[PDB]
Amino acid sequence: IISKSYKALINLVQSEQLVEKIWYRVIDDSLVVGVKTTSSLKLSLNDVTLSLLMDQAHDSRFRLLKCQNRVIKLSTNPFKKECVQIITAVTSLSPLLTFSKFCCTVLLQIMERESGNCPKDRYVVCGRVFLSLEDLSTGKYLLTFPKKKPIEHMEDLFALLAAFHKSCFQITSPGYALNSMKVWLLEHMKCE
Amino acid sequence: CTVLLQIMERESGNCPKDRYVVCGRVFLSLEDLSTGKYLLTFPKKKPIEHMEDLFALLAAFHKSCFQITSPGYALNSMKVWLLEHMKCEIIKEFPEVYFCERPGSFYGTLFTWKQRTPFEGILIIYSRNQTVMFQCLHNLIRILPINCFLKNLKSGSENFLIDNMAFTLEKELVTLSSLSSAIAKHESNKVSGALYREITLKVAEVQLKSDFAAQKLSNL
Amino acid sequence: REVAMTDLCPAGPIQAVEIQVESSSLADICRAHHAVVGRMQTMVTEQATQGSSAPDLRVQYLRQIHANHETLLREVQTLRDRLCTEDEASSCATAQRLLQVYRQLRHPSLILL
Amino acid sequence: LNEAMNVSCALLSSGTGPRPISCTTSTTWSRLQTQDVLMATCVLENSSSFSLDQGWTLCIQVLTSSCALDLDSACSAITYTIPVDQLGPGARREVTLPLGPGENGGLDLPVTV
Amino acid sequence: LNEAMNVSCALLSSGTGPRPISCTTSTTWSRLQTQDVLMATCVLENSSSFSLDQGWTLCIQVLTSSCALDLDSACSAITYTIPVDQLGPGARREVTLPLGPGENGGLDLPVTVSCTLFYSLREVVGGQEGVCLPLSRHTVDMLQCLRFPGLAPPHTRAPSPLGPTRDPVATFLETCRELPPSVASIKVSA
């Protein structure tokens, strides 16, 4: 009946897979959580976020848990055509690593911005990430640099696109054109 | 930048020594660094032979200090854990310092180890954030004895705080027994309230020291 | 509160104001005592060189205080010699006995008259 | 669970006043290290009987500007999340955040929480 | 240079109450996220005409529990600084910064803020170092750091602190590895 009643509880509040899939990496003292969307979820129309929630059986204490939310859109073999929209979050490690381990639940919230009724506050618990020192004692989720030069699990690239400090730039060379970039990038910096 | 070293004395409650020194300047700019020159960026700066490098870490690094007692058992699995599990280099110049060379996620984390009375050591962990200090104790708890008792130490070691507390009280009890003895000669010569007040100031000055050593041991 | 104490002084129990502090935490008491006795050094050195001085009994209770100080001084001295020799039960009973010493002494501390 | 169903049902009802649980937010200029900062105080207040047991937890979400851009910002929004324990009827929690500039001196509005 | 000696003379001399430049240190309880926290509002005030031009700066140094510990503490103290820019007559500024609980109520209390000013021409023109003129050396007690919520004026429901039941390093260690009220009092002459 109890079980009957959660499912009753869950249909009380209320099919289409809005979110593929959860993943996470550890960057150093940074927990970086992310996910992959589908077509269904239009970031044009919906401000969305991605919270974490800790399990109280471990966390006997009121520590408030914060997280920072980024959107990462990457164009995929531009040389229809695939855009990759991914939403992802961050916060600190050593707060959680109080009990050798915890389990963080992972909650994507969605509000509409067209409608000033906020008629459509959907959510979706898009899974759960268990982690521990014994997970990391054997690497497995860290990124530790240059050995992980050959970057072939795309999670690891997106970890660095959330965790790192993003600074943007316009460059106008107005009595020239501008091709030194490719040289600098590929040569002086030796970009792969 | 200008570099300014201020100096207060503790002993005197007058604030009579506010000696200041201006101990030089440091110019820095983008180009000094664009050529390295000062930077510490790792594994090349392994063979450590500008001690200014060592100190710069002992400074920028999150510090964690731990008591270890293995009560019914001498303790040298440290000397194996240090040099073999974590792959330490001892810095020759200061041979009580260990720089970790295990090549993933422990690299450039510094220990130090005093083993006085081979049961009771004391360990100090310099880490590059706190996840790293956790992953060390975890990796050490696996390798320790069964009774080896870890404990977190904010402000000095237990032995020294008990010695400090014990001395600030033993001086205090002597200064209050000196109160009574200074009155007990006044009997042979009713007491000067002025003398009583005089001695309560000196005893108050030592009570303030026992209070401080007691909050230190009554945290611990 | 006010507590007049007649076997401190020979003639007049002054109606001396007593200050208590009571808490779970012995550290918070050590801190609040430290702050308050600093504050009582301040007020006493501000008033001394201007105010007068009360006479004492000289007898009975200064000697009560002498005997109860001497017993504790011997105890701390023997404790320091044992802590130097480093026999067994390294310093747990020593810690919990020296806090008992502290508690004993603090309850009346510096009746300033 | 039954108290959960009751709370849920009462909120999803519009009886026209958000009786059962309310949370007020309101703004407070602080000062830090030098600089004037903006804090949003977030009060949770229980009017109703229902005692928000263990199992319950609060998320706040701090949305920047809306209108998703050409360049994807550094920080789209932040979310803070706390467990509510044993709230009880009548009883309340307050929480203040930052909303305010560290980078740029740059605070742009409307911001919604 | 002139204004420097006029100011230095004013502050060093005049063993009086009213000094032309002053640094009041108060304390305050503030609330962040959830926690309650301790702010030093350090107010510099300029009662005179001397107008601290430039080359003029200010050097707060926040001393801990002051005793000679064998291991050490992670942090001996903090040392903030600021350039004071123009600060004409009568004018003032407020600087808020933390003392507030170190990691696990970690606040041994004697804790002193000591303000200084610092004068150097090497800034304007050299030619021979600088000046440190001390100012407002206040201490913080325990007796200022107590808060009285039952007595408090509003009689408004503020949540009870109940600070962390263990240290995070302590919890970590216990998990990885598996009474009377204390008193003091004083008597003092009426």
- The DSSP string of B34-53 is HT-SS---SSS--S---THH
Query: Do the Cβ atoms of E63 and B8 come within 8 Å?
Result: yes
Strands E61-63 and B120-127: unpaired
Size of interface C-E (CB pairs under 8 A): 89
CA-only gyration radius of chain C, Å: 18
Query: Do the Cβ atoms of D83 and A109 come within 8 Å?
Result: no
CA–centroid distance for D74 within its chain: 22
CA–centroid distance for C112 within its chain: 11
Distance CA E46, CA E93 (A): 9
Single-letter residue type at C44: V
Residue of chain A whose Cα is closest to the Cα of B135: A133
Angle at E74 (CA atoms; ends E42, A30), nearest 5 degrees: 95
For tokens 């601290």, the residue is E52
Distance CA C90, CA B68 (A): 13
In the stretch 42-71 of chain D, residues with CB closer than 8 A to chain E read none
Distances (CA, A) of B59 to B55, B63, B97, E78: 6, 9, 14, 13
DSSP type of residue C46: H
Single-letter residue type at B31: E
Distance CA A96, CA A93 (A): 6
Neighbours of C9 (CB within 10 A): 19
Distance CA D7, CA E55 (A): 64
For tokens 């409307």, the residue is D110
Strands E77-78 and E111-119: unpaired
Hey, CA dihedral for B165, B171, B173, B179, is it positive or negative? Answer: negative
One DSSP character per residue, B164-182 reads HHHHHHHHHHHHHHHHHHH
Query: Do the Cβ atoms of B135 and A133 come within 8 Å?
Result: yes
Rounded to 10 degrees, the C-alpha dihedral C57/C63/C69/C70 comes to 150
B186 SS3 class? helix
Question: C2 and E190 in contact (C-beta within 8 Å)?
Answer: yes
User: Residue B105: which of A94, A134, A144 has the nearest Cβ?
Assistant: A144
Question: B91 and B47 in contact (C-beta within 8 Å)?
Answer: no
Question: What are E13's two structure tokens?
Answer: 């001399």
Distances (CA, A) of B75 to A85, B91, B144: 55, 22, 9
Q: How many CA atoms lie within 13 A of B122 on its CB side?
A: 15
Query: Do the Cβ atoms of B212 and E173 come within 8 Å?
Result: no
Residue of chain E whose Cα is closest to the Cα of A95: E168
Residue of chain C whose Cα is closest to the Cα of B213: C30
Among D2, D59, D69, D85, the residue to mutate for chain A (most A Cβ within 10 A): D59
Question: What are B117's two structure tokens?
Answer: 């009375």
Give the N- to C-terminal CA distance of chain D in Å, as an integer: 28
DSSP type of residue A97: T
Distance CA B191, CA B37 (A): 73
Question: Does an H or E element contain C107, and which?
Answer: none
User: Residue C108: which of E108, E182, E185 has the nearest Cβ?
Assistant: E185
Question: What are B57's two structure tokens?
Answer: 């870490």
Among A70, A83, A104, A118, the residue to mutate for chain D (most D Cβ within 10 A): A70
Residue length, chain B?
A: 220
CA–centroid distance for D112 within its chain: 10
Rounded to 10 degrees, the C-alpha dihedral B48/B51/B52/B53 comes to 20
Question: What are A1's two structure tokens?
Answer: 């009946």
Residues contacting residue E97 through CB under 8 Å, at least 6 positions apart: D32, D33, E39, E40, E42, E60, E62, E80
Burial label, A5 (beta-carbon count in 10 A; 0-12, 13-18, 19+): middle
Residues contacting residue C20 through CB under 8 Å, at least 6 positions apart: C1, E183, E184, E185
- Whether residue D37 lies within 8 A of chain A, CB to CB, comes out as no
Question: Does an H or E element contain E138, and which?
Answer: strand E131-140
Question: What are A51's two structure tokens?
Answer: 């919270």
In the stretch 14-33 of chain D, residues with CB closer than 8 A to chain E read 30-33
User: Residue E95: which of D34, D92, D93 has the nearest Cβ?
Assistant: D34
Distance CA B125, CA B144 (A): 16
Contacts of D61 in chain A (CB under 8 A): 49, 51, 109
C85 SS3 class? helix
- Whether residue C31 lies within 8 A of chain E, CB to CB, comes out as yes
Distance CA A47, CA B51 (A): 52
Question: Which ranges constitute the DSSP H helices of C1-113?
Answer: 26-47, 61-85, 93-106
Query: Do the Cβ atoms of E176 and A60 come within 8 Å?
Result: no
Query: Do the Cβ atoms of D1 and A70 come within 8 Å?
Result: no
Helices A2-13, D2-12: axis angle to 10 degrees equals 10
Closest by CA to B127, choosing from B144, B154, B105, is B105
**Letter string b/e over residues D41-76, b meaning 16 or more CB atoms within 10 A of that residue's CB:** ebebbbebebebeeebbbbbbbbbeeebeeebeeeb
Touch between chain C and chain B: 3 or more Cβ pairs under 8 Å? yes
Distance CA C5, CA C38 (A): 24
User: Residue E170: which of B15, B65, B152 has the nearest Cβ?
Assistant: B152
Q: Which residues pair with A13 in a beta bridge?
A: none
Query: Do the Cβ atoms of A99 and E172 come within 8 Å?
Result: yes
- Whether residue E108 lies within 8 A of chain C, CB to CB, comes out as yes
Question: C17 and E190 in contact (C-beta within 8 Å)?
Answer: yes
DSSP type of residue E131: E
Distance CA B129, CA B105 (A): 11
For tokens 């002597």, the residue is B174
Question: B174 and B203 in contact (C-beta within 8 Å)?
Answer: no
Question: C56 and C9 in contact (C-beta within 8 Å)?
Answer: yes
- Whether residue B134 lies within 8 A of chain A, CB to CB, comes out as yes
Distance CA D41, CA D23 (A): 10
Neighbours of B203 (CB within 10 A): 20
Question: What are B62's two structure tokens?
Answer: 């999150």
Distances (CA, A) of B80 to B76, B102, C40, D43, E113: 7, 14, 56, 55, 46
Residue length, chain C?
A: 113
Contacts 24+ apart (CB under 8 A), A111-118: A111/A46, A111/A47, A111/A48, A111/D63, A112/A45, A112/A46, A113/A45, A113/A46, A113/A47, A113/D66, A113/D67, A114/A45
Closest by CA to E189, choosing from B200, C113, C5, C12, is C113
DSSP type of residue E152: -
C58 SS3 class? coil
Question: What are E140's two structure tokens?
Answer: 């913080």
Among C6, C8, C34, the residue to mutate for chain E (most E Cβ within 10 A): C34
Distance CA D44, CA D80 (A): 14
Distance CA A93, CA B131 (A): 7
Hey, CA dihedral for E11, E14, E20, E22, is it positive or negative? Answer: positive
E4: left (phi over 0), alpha (psi -120 to 50) or beta: alpha
Question: Which ranges constitute the DSSP H helices of chain D?
Answer: 2-12
Distance CA C102, CA A87 (A): 59
Contacts of B27 in chain E (CB under 8 A): none
In this complex, which chains have at least 3 CB pairs below 8 Å with chain B? A, C, E
Closest by CA to B155, choosing from B212, B71, B96, is B212
Query: Do the Cβ atoms of E168 and A98 come within 8 Å?
Result: yes
Single-letter residue type at B68: I
Query: Do the Cβ atoms of A67 and D79 come within 8 Å?
Result: yes
Question: E114 and E63 in contact (C-beta within 8 Å)?
Answer: yes
Helix-, strand-, coil-residue percentages of chain A, each rounded to 5: 20, 35, 45
Size of interface A-B (CB pairs under 8 A): 35
Size of interface B-E (CB pairs under 8 A): 75
For tokens 């100080």, the residue is C69
Question: What are D110's two structure tokens?
Answer: 């409307």
Helix-, strand-, coil-residue percentages of chain D, each rounded to 5: 10, 40, 50
In this complex, which chains have at least 3 CB pairs below 8 Å with chain D? A, E
For tokens 């050798």, the residue is A100
Distance CA B175, CA B180 (A): 9
Neighbours of E157 (CB within 10 A): 16
Give the N- to C-terminal CA distance of chain A in Å, as an integer: 58
**Letter string b/e over residues A72-99, b meaning 16 or more CB atoms within 10 A of that residue's CB:** beeeeeeeeeeeebbbbbbbbbbbbbbb
Distance CA E110, CA E102 (A): 14
Distance CA C68, CA B177 (A): 9
Give A64 to chain E, closest Cα distance, Å. Answer: 7
Residue of chain C whose Cα is closest to the Cα of B211: C30
Distance CA A44, CA A113 (A): 9
Touch between chain A and chain B: 3 or more Cβ pairs under 8 Å? yes
Distance CA C35, CA D39 (A): 34
Question: What are A125's two structure tokens?
Answer: 């618990």
Distance CA B70, CA B120 (A): 7
Question: A97 and A38 in contact (C-beta within 8 Å)?
Answer: no
Give C108 to chain E, closest Cα distance, Å. Answer: 6
Resolution in A: 4.2
Task: Extract the runs of DSSP E, i.e. beta strands, from chain B.
Answer: 2-8, 18-25, 62-69, 88-90, 97-100, 110-115, 120-127, 149-152
Rounded to 10 degrees, the C-alpha dihedral B136/B142/B147/B153 comes to 10
- Whether residue C98 lies within 8 A of chain E, CB to CB, comes out as no
Distance CA E64, CA E74 (A): 11
Distance CA E20, CA E41 (A): 20
Question: What are B138's two structure tokens?
Answer: 């975890």
Question: What are E85's two structure tokens?
Answer: 């820019």
Angle at B114 (CA atoms; ends B112, B117), nearest 5 degrees: 160
Question: Does an H or E element contain C54, and which?
Answer: none
- Whether residue C69 lies within 8 A of chain E, CB to CB, comes out as no
Question: E11 and E135 in contact (C-beta within 8 Å)?
Answer: yes
Question: E97 and E37 in contact (C-beta within 8 Å)?
Answer: no
